[PDB]
Design an enzyme around this catalytic site. Sequence first.
Site, PDB file in Angstrom:
ATOM      1  N   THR A 204       0.869  -0.922  -0.083  1.00  0.00           N
ATOM      2  CA  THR A 204       0.305   0.148   0.098  1.00  0.00           C
ATOM      3  C   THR A 204       0.833   1.344  -0.205  1.00  0.00           C
ATOM      4  O   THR A 204       0.457   2.216   0.003  1.00  0.00           O
ATOM      5  CB  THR A 204      -1.165  -0.109   1.526  1.00  0.00           C
ATOM      6  OG1 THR A 204       0.116   0.531   2.556  1.00  0.00           O
ATOM      7  CG2 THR A 204      -2.143  -1.194   1.296  1.00  0.00           C
ATOM      8  N   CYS A 205       1.857   1.048   0.460  1.00  0.00           N
ATOM      9  CA  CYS A 205       3.413   2.217   0.536  1.00  0.00           C
ATOM     10  C   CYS A 205       3.718   2.680  -0.539  1.00  0.00           C
ATOM     11  O   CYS A 205       3.822   3.642  -1.176  1.00  0.00           O
ATOM     12  CB  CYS A 205       4.233   1.872   1.645  1.00  0.00           C
ATOM     13  SG  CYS A 205       5.228   0.690   0.919  1.00  0.00           S
ATOM     14  N   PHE A 206       3.310   1.867  -1.785  1.00  0.00           N
ATOM     15  CA  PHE A 206       3.748   1.844  -2.752  1.00  0.00           C
ATOM     16  C   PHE A 206       2.217   1.971  -4.131  1.00  0.00           C
ATOM     17  O   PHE A 206       2.573   1.497  -5.795  1.00  0.00           O
ATOM     18  CB  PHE A 206       4.695   0.440  -4.080  1.00  0.00           C
ATOM     19  CG  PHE A 206       6.505   0.831  -2.705  1.00  0.00           C
ATOM     20  CD1 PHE A 206       6.402   1.846  -2.479  1.00  0.00           C
ATOM     21  CD2 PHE A 206       6.448  -0.612  -1.951  1.00  0.00           C
ATOM     22  CE1 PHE A 206       8.096   2.240  -1.737  1.00  0.00           C
ATOM     23  CE2 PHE A 206       8.040  -0.157  -1.094  1.00  0.00           C
ATOM     24  CZ  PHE A 206       8.133   0.882  -1.419  1.00  0.00           C
TER      25      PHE A 206
END
Length: 333
Positions: free
Chosen positions: A305-307
């Site tokens: 989710t960070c990417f």
Amino acid sequence: DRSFRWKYHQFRFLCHSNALPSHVKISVSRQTLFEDSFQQIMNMKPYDLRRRLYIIMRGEEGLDYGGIAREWFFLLSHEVLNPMYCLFEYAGKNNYCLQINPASSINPDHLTYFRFIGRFIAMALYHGKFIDTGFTLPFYKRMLNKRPTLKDLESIDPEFYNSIVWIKENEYIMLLTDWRFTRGVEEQTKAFLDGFNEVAPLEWLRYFDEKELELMLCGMQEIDMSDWQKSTIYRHYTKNSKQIQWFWQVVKEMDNEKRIRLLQFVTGTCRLPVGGFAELIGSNGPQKFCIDKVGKETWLPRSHTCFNRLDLPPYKSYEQLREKLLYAIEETE
């Protein structure tokens, strides 16, 4: 295990069974909104906030108090994000991952303000109103007595997550994981939970999961399939690969709720960025929806989710990919 629709109806009905007659007035000005709302709400009994809301915007002729209520909720939910109040902050660039500011104690009466924010969110949930504060999924986890996990660590702190993921693979880990989420924000969080619990019992959220709760607070929006597919990039895969074609097939097959669930699964939120998927934000700056050929076909697809990245295994069949995608979307984070 019931549908989100069912949980929604049950929650709304539960709120209505405990509804109080009459009404309450909240008099504010749109440039003293924060302090006026604070003073008004905190000077009232919690249960009285269950009564029908009449927000009195001083100096306006409108009589549509529903719209005034909604606008008030939005405006205030954005006003609590003012860095001047030192109540909230962000863990990453571009307002990524909202979190309670550990330095909030710079104002000695901050706990009262967090309790007020709790009351506020509780009011928004109770009266079926939507907010745009942008609480992360682990926050909602805390609201549902769910402990934040390692995956969540990847969501809010990629470098910390990478470090820990390395330590392991080549109990301590668990304490670290908890500490990253709970550091310096204990009393603020508990105050928020208490303020919320004053107006609407946390127990009423018992059936919801974090994403469903976020859906309850942010409200559903139709997802532009076209804009999503246009702003999607690929690694190793191409847009003509079997798995990608099958993927978009599945997505178009989905109803809006399922697409929202997918959006939450891959990006960590149901909220769309301003300007569509092209302006999608992850950690380390702007990052569009990406699909990567990672993992064995015996594995589920997984997210970063960070990417905003979806590790999608090279499944040999459309049905296999569909099954695994739906399951991963509904049962894993």
